[PDB]
């Protein structure tokens, strides 16, 4: 009756930024989503295709937990079907999703008085993202007929802007830590039961 590591994915000491998020696989486990559900410290616990209280007696074979940090107002764009900056350039969920999106406030944890400038997000990309696809590419971006090759001049810009995370920012611009719990079912035996 040896419970699964969720104390590695939620109360971690430092999450990653959104443009290179952290994908972690769950294998050989037994979880209990009611402890996640009846903690009442999370702000947005929305499940998108499975009912949350019946999650314990539902036995899957691999769970994927993705962790990243976004602005507080952009937690709406971690839903199936929404578009926006983060949604089409940073982290796109497919529109047949079945999982649980968790979010809670983390200002004290991720905000220095001068402001942390190590949480970044993708601003310029050629096209949108197909779902569940990261793109850690620090190459400069370009627009009309002439390419840059790293000069960073006019018509060429770095693909990242920095989040401004100050302790006096607003309840909607405080940095929110999200975790996208995502379920799957491969042709394999049951590995996580609950």
């Amino acid at each position, epitope marked *: 009756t040896n419970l699964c590591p969720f104390g590695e994915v939620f109360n971690a000491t430092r999450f990653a930024s959104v443009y290179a998020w952290n994908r972690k696989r769950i294998s050989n486990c037994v979880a209990d989503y009611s402890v996640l559900y009846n903690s009442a410290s999370f*702000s947005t616990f929305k499940c998108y295709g499975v009912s949350p209280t019946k999650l314990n007696d539902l036995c899957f074979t691999n769970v994927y937990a993705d962790s990243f940090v976004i602005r507080g107002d952009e937690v709406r764009q971690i839903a199936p079907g929404q578009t926006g900056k983060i949604a089409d350039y940073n982290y796109k969920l497919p529109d047949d999703f079945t999982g649980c999106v968790i979010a809670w406030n983390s200002n004290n944890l991720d905000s220095k008085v001068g402001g942390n400038y190590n949480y970044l997000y993708r601003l310029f990309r050629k096209s949108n993202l197909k779902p569940f696809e990261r793109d850690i590419s620090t190459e400069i971006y370009q627009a009309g007929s002439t390419p840059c090759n790293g000069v960073e001049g006019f018509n060429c810009y770095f693909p990242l802007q920095s989040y401004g995370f100050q302790p006096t920012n*607003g309840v909607g611009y405080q940095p929110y830590r999200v975790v996208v719990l995502s379920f799957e079912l491969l042709h394999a035996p049951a590995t996580v039961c609950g």
Partner: antibody, heavy 121, light 104 residues
């Protein structure tokens, strides 16, 4: 039907401390978040205090963090805003506000009537 | 941080005609709410999520916009719309200025 009243406002001394009570009844109290919204007499409203629905998330702006401690009690269905060490900027009309969602993110549906607080001798 | 600005200070349109209100943000936000106070009365909610009328407002009011510009336009103003109209969002700590729409 739904109604929220304010009582406990008067005149206090500069550097003085008192507690603004907001009585609320008529709706399911412990499933909604609430906030305090103040109005300086230049009629420019300003968010001053915010608590979540349960009570585990409390929010204050950068000016009054460390002077205002919000409170919540679902037993008597009240709301307390503990003012302390008031400057000359806290002379305002303080309002009691009920949110719509289970967090502070949603719109502010119903408001109180308003209590008068001033900082004068 | 965000300061929400409304311009001009006091707007005035004659009876039954169309006026519009602005609420310009210094950055990008998803939605925008619109609260309205009369003189000597606590403010009440008119519009949540920039396009939905509250239960109690007449259905002449509307508004649209996303990103860095938000609106509240009235197709035919009435004499009871002699009030202040404050815009406010989740991410401010400070309300808008408030264009006191007074009739002409």
């Amino acid at each position: 039907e739904v109604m929220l009243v304010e009582s406990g406002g008067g005149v206090v001394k500069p550097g003085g401390s008192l507690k603004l009570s907001c009585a609320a009844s008529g709706f399911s109290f412990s499933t909604y978040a609430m906030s305090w919204i103040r109005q300086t007499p230049e009629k420019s409203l300003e968010w001053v205090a915010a608590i979540s629905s349960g009570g585990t998330n409390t929010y204050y702006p950068g000016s009054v963090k460390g002077r205002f401690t919000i409170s919540r009690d679902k037993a008597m269905n009240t709301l307390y805003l503990q003012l302390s060490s008031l400057r000359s900027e806290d002379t305002a009309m303080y309002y009691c506000v009920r949110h719509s969602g289970n967090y502070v993110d949603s719109v502010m549906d119903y408001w109180g009537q308003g209590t008068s607080v001033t900082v004068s001798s | 941080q965000i300061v929400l600005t409304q311009s001009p200070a006091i707007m005035s349109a004659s009876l039954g005609e169309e006026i519009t209100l602005t609420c310009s943000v210094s950055s990008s936000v998803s939605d925008m709410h619109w609260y309205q106070q009369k003189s000597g009365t606590s403010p009440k909610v008119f519009i949540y999520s920039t396009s939905n009328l509250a239960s109690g407002v007449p259905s002449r009011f509307s508004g649209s916009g996303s990103g860095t510009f938000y609106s509240l336009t009235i197709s035919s103003v009435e004499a009871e719309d002699a009030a202040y109209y404050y815009c406010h969002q989740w991410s401010s700590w400070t309300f808008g200025g408030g264009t006191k729409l007074e009739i002409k």
